[PDB]
Amino acid sequence: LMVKVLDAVRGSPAINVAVHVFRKFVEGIYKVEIDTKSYWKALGSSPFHEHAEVVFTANDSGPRRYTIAALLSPYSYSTTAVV
Amino acid sequence: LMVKVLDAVRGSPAINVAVHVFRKFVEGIYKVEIDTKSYWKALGSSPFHEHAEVVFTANDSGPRRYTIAALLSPYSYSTTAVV
Amino acid sequence: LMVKVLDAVRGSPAINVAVHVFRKFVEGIYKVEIDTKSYWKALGSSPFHEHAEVVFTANDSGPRRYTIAALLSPYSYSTTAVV
Amino acid sequence: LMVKVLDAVRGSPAINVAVHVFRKFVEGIYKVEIDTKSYWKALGSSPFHEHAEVVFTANDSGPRRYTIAALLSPYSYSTTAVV
Amino acid sequence: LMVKVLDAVRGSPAINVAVHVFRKFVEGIYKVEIDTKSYWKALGSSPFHEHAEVVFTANDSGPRRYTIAALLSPYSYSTTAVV
């Protein structure tokens, strides 16, 4: 078994590398998260077993704008602006 | 077994690399998430078993705009703008 | 078993590296999180067993804007601005 | 078993490295968190067992803005500004 | 078993390194946290067992702004400003 990555580099690059090797167990190597809203996750073992009265209401209001100039997209010789 | 990636580089590139090798177990290598809304996930083992009264209402209001100049798309010699 | 990454570098790069080797257990190597809102997570073992009255309301209001010039995207020779 | 990273460097780079080796257990190597709001986490063993009256309300108001010039994205020869 | 990182360096770099080796248990090597608000965590063993009346309200108000010139992103030859 031989694994070789990026033996020689002369210029000035910008590089993201992730090498995983498994031989004979979870993992997250590059993760980004924005505005994650999850309610009532993994709610116990036996809740609300016999009798329950629940008023579930959720409110998040307002004009929401998302601007991304680049999502998973590098450049080499470029100009990028978000006015 | 021999695996070789990017032996020699002379210029100045912008590179994203992910190498996985399995030989004889989950994983997320590049993940991006925006505005994920999941309600009542993995709700216990035996909830609401016999009698239940649930009022489930969800409200998220407002004009929503999403602008992405590039999603999974690199450039080499370009100009990119989002006015 | 031989694993080699970035043997020789001459210029002045900007590099992110993560190497994982498993031989015969979780892990997070690069994680970023912004505005994560999760309510009632892993709620005990047996809560609200017999009788319960719950008024669940959640409010987060206001115009919300997110601007990202680059998400997982390096540059080599560029100009980037967010006015 | 042989693992070699960055044998020789001559210029002046800016490098982030994380090497993990497991041979035959959790861990977080690079973590960043901004505005994490999680209510009622790991709530005891058996709370609210028989009778309960709960008024759950949450309020966080105001225009909220997030500006990030770069999230997981290095540069080599660039200019970056956020006016 | 042989692990070698950064054998020789001649210039003047800025380097962050974390090496972990396990052979046959938790840990946090690089952690940053800003504005973490978690209420009622690990609430006893059996609180609020039989009868309870709880008024849970939370208020944090005001326009909130977050500006980050770089999050997990080094430079080599750059200029960075946040006016």
Q: Is A18 helix (H, G, I), strand (E, B) or coil?
A: strand
**For residues C36 and C27, what is the distance between their CA atoms, to the nearest angstrom?**
20
For A7, the token pair is 């033996």
* Nearest CA distance, D2 vs chain A (angstrom): 10
C77-82 β-sheet, strand order? B77-82, A77-82, C77-82, D77-82, E77-82
Q: Which amino acid is at E52?
A: A
Residue A38 to residues A70, B19, C82, E33, E69, Cα–Cα distance (Å): 26, 32, 30, 21, 29
> Contact, A66 vs B66, CB < 8 A?
yes
DSSP of E6-49: --EE-S--EEEEEEEEEE----EEEEEEEEEEEES-S--SS-S-
By the CB < 8 Å criterion, does A12 face chain D? yes
| The pairing of beta strand E8-9 with beta strand C8-9 | unpaired
| The pairing of beta strand B8-9 with beta strand E2-5 | unpaired
| The pairing of beta strand A14-23 with beta strand B28-39 | unpaired
The phi-psi region of residue E44 (left if phi > 0; otherwise alpha if psi is between -120 and 50; otherwise beta) is left
For C8, the token pair is 């020789």
Q: What is the largest CA-CA distance in chain C?
A: 70
CB contact under 8 A, D76 and A14: yes
**For residues E14 and E12, what is the distance between their CA atoms, to the nearest angstrom?**
7
Q: Is A39 helix (H, G, I), strand (E, B) or coil?
A: strand
**For residues E81 and E74, what is the distance between their CA atoms, to the nearest angstrom?**
14
Secondary structure of chain D in HEC code, one letter for each residue: CEEEECCEECCCCEEEEEEEEEECCCCEEEEEEEEEEEECCCCCCCCCCCCCEEEEEEECCCCEEEEECCECCCCCEEEEEEC
| The pairing of beta strand D77-82 with beta strand E77-82 | parallel
**For residues C8 and A75, what is the distance between their CA atoms, to the nearest angstrom?**
24
For E40, the token pair is 């009622």
CB contact under 8 A, C82 and A61: no
What are the phi and psi torsion angles at E44 (to 5°)? 55, -160
Asked whether residue A78 is marked as a ligand-binding residue, the answer is yes
- The residue assigned the tokens 């980037």 is C80
Asked whether residue C4 is marked as a ligand-binding residue, the answer is yes
What are the phi and psi torsion angles at E82 (to 5°)? -130, 95
First to last CA, chain D: 50
Buried-state track B4-43, b at ≥16 Cβ within 10 A, e below 16 = eebeebeebbbbbeeeeeeeeeeeeebebebeeeeeeeeb
Q: Which amino acid is at B69?
A: A
For A50, the token pair is 């016999």
CB contact under 8 A, D21 and E18: no
**For residues E72 and B26, what is the distance between their CA atoms, to the nearest angstrom?**
25
Instruction: Specify the resolution in Å.
Output: 3.1
- For chain C, what's the residue count? 83
Q: Which amino acid is at B15?
A: I
**For residues A49 and C72, what is the distance between their CA atoms, to the nearest angstrom?**
45
* Nearest CA distance, D75 vs chain B (angstrom): 9
Residues in contact with B69: Cβ distance below 8 Å, sequence separation at least 6, in sequence order: A68, A69, A70, A80, A82, B80, B81, B82
A75 closest CA partner among B15, C71, C69: B15
By the CB < 8 Å criterion, does A12 face chain E? yes
Chain-centre distance of CA B43, in angstroms? 24
- The residue assigned the tokens 């498994």 is A22
By the CB < 8 Å criterion, does D75 face chain A? yes
Residue A63 DSSP code: -
> Contact, D73 vs C15, CB < 8 A?
no
Chain-centre distance of CA C32, in angstroms? 3
For E20, the token pair is 């972990």
- The residue assigned the tokens 């998302």 is A66
**For residues D53 and C53, what is the distance between their CA atoms, to the nearest angstrom?**
5
Q: How was this structure determined?
A: cryo-EM
E72 closest CA partner among D57, D60, D75, D52: D75
Instruction: Give the torsion through C-alpha atoms of C34, D30, A16, A66, to 10 deg.
Output: 0
Residue A2 to residues A15, B4, B19, B31, E64, Cα–Cα distance (Å): 21, 8, 13, 28, 51
D79 closest CA partner among E70, C32, C65, A69: E70
What are the phi and psi torsion angles at A70 (to 5°)? -160, 125
Residue E42 CB-half CA count within 13 A: 0
Query: Within a 10 A sphere around the Cβ of C38, how many other Cβ atoms?
Result: 18
